[PDB]
Amino acid sequence: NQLIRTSGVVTSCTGVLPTIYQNYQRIRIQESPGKVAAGRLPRSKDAILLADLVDSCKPGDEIELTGIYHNNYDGSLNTANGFPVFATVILANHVAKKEDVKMITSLSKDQQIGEKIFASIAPSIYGHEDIKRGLALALFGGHKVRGDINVLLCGDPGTAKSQFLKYIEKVSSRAIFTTGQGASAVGLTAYVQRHPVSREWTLEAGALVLADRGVCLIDEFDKMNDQDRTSIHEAMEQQSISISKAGIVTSLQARCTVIAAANPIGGRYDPSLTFSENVDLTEPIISRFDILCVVRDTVDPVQDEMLARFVVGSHVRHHPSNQEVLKKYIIYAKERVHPKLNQMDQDKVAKMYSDLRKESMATGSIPITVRHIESMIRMAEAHARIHLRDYVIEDDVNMAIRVMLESFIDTQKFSVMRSMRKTFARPEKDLVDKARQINIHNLSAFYDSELFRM
Amino acid sequence: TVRQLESMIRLSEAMARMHCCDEVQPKHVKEAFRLLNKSIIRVSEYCRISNLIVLHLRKVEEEEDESALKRSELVNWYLKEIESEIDSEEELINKKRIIEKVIHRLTHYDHVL
Secondary structure (H helix, E strand, O other), rough: EEEEEEEOOOOOOOEEEEEOHOOOOEHHHHHHHHOOOHOOOOOOOEEEEEEOOOOOOOOOOOOEEEEEOOOOOHHHHHHOOOOOOOOOOOOOOOOOOOOOOHHHHHHOOOOOOHHHHHOOOOOOOHHHHHHHHHHHHHHHOOOOOOOOOOOOOOOOOOOOOHHHHHHHHHHOOOOOOOOOOOOOOOOOOOOOOOOHHHHOOOOOHHHHHHHHOEEEEOOOOHHHOHHHHHHHHHHHHHHHOOOOOOHHHHHHHOEEEOOOOOOOOOOOOOOOOOOOOOOOOOOHHHOOOOOOOOOOOOOOHHHHHHHHHHHHHHHHHOOOOOOOHHHHHHHHHHHHOOOOOOOHHHHHHHHHHHHHHHOOOOOOOOOOOHHHHHHHHHHHHHHHHOOOOOOOOOHHHHHHHHHHHHHHHHHHHOOHHHHHHHHHOOOHHHHHHHHHHOOOOOOOOOOHHHHOOO | OOOHHHHHHHHHHHHHHHOOOOOOOOOOHHHHHHHHHHHHHOOOOOHHHOOOHHHHHHHHHHHHHHOOOOOHHHHHHHHHHHOOOOOOOHHHHHHHHHHHHHHHHHHHHHHOO
């Protein structure tokens, strides 16, 4: 019974859904953001639209909600469901329609701290050199200028390696653990349940919507149910729902960086049969992984020695005995750095990678796909975003080479030790290749003066 | 797995809590070691693919180069195959002792033809 000031985000609209119940509709709203202090689970809001703000609300509006919480519980007739602990009917009254940052920013441009920054990226376990690259790319998360990152890990769940992704939420702003089946409410997958005579069908709001222009973290991806796979297969391809029948049109935004880790089925390579050729599953779902990394070395007690002492030392600190400055340095950078492109140097950048493709076509029969390259070009993008030095050093060149060699190990039989020694030791699709020869992405660049008129 | 490291750390709380007499004698040290050692032990891999499929298909070419088989030549040709692949040569000798028990079991059971 008091006017309350708060904030919230509109997530979805219910135009796509089909007389007492018809007066109102149902929407899924959260208030608590991702934070270390917000670790305890909060009480979710369920707002009711009384046919007033329908079709006027669009996703991505960081708006403020103000009103009074009257507990005018309309379910006195006991013919519906009920609200959580915050037992009150929530009405909508405010939706808009149309510093330490500076001190850190001063240190951000400084090059003295810009040198040791990539030598402290992974202090928890020190991991593997490839993982840090994936983490750094994920931290920045970088018209139709979009992209997705598939970071792969090869371990086992019993070791905390499976739990290594848990440490990301300390740095990430939006992390939700699915654990597979029976996740928290909606686990990014849409499902249908049987409802009584008078209740509202559920519009499934995934964490995909809640992290618009954000980052969404997925754990235990391969332990999800087979049924969920069928629904999610189509949405992941387009990161939205697009219908072009010109009769029914709608769009639902899902633009987070899909971060997930695959779990090997049983043993690593105990069976003696082929890995790629012995799969009954569907091709397009498996082929969503851009990089297929293999583990390097098996028995290294010296490397394993360091981790054990970390555990022992860690347990010491927790027993009784009688730095946000560094967290936000990388995160804030991805919002301010937006360099421009030079027209006379655009060809030279794209020229270098094109040469590497045609080399692989000499001895073979189209054995390399452009799609793998398609991820590699966006990966180099963060390099310029970090240093802004206009060139790439040869030190980084060696590291990116190790990415590709691991991929060939998994797909090819161990006989890769004979044919690929030299690299290791030292018609719609055809038209796409044609564009790389001229270094022009736009296929409608002829008479672009008349497109501006329209 | 390393998880037992936490478990073995938990073991120490039983030992220290028992006496709390602020006195150490050497007798408690020797006797403790014997009990722990016996109980604890009981309660792509290059080795796993070379023996079962590679050696079966490798002996066709090697026989044309060597007239006979010698124990001295067995380790000699193996080193050249794995040159610059592993920067650990000392651990190879450990493989020598294990395989001898393995290979003798394979002959009566006819697992490798």
